[PDB]
């Protein structure tokens, strides 16, 4: 539960700016005028390139069948299965 709860503070502090609260106003004015005149970080969420993504999808979909074979192989080794056989 602590390992689970580790994430959100890191999420906050990546979202939190780097100025101390005595000097967070310099960021505050810039963000307020930026949203007055006019987005997550790429290190947490990013639209990848489509051809890169296709290569990635083919890679993992290749690995899936490699998982499945050993999965059913070890699942054959339960003793109830040998009794049935």
């Amino acid at each position: 539960i602590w390992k689970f709860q580790r994430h959100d503070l890191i999420e906050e502090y990546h979202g939190r700016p780097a100025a101390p609260p005595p000097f967070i106003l310099l960021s505050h004015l810039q963000l307020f005028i930026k949203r007055v005149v006019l987005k997550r970080h790429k290190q947490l969420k990013n639209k990848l390139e489509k051809n890169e993504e296709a290569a990635l999808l083919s890679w993992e979909i290749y690995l899936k069948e490699n998982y499945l074979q050993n999965r059913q192989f070890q699942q054959k080794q339960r003793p109830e299965q040998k009794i049935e056989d």
């Binding site: 290569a55 083919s58 890679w59 290749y62």
Partner: protein, 89 residues
Amino acid sequence: SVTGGAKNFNMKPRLKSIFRRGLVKVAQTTGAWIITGGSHTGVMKQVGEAVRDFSLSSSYKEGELITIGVATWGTVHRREGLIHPTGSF
């Protein structure tokens, strides 16, 4: 040396499974030389695909299953671009 049907080839899925694991598994350990006809159609296409994805999935492993194709010079589509009189390096 694998041989098969080129233009008019159809296969059940069970036959397809052996090409993915049986041919590649026995080629990759011994350091084989898969020699076949050089064509994009049929069985030679199946060997060509089933050896490619191994090289991607190898995760920067050393060595590649070397493959040599032999086809006739007559029945090539765009071979007029291939003839260079000097050394086409």
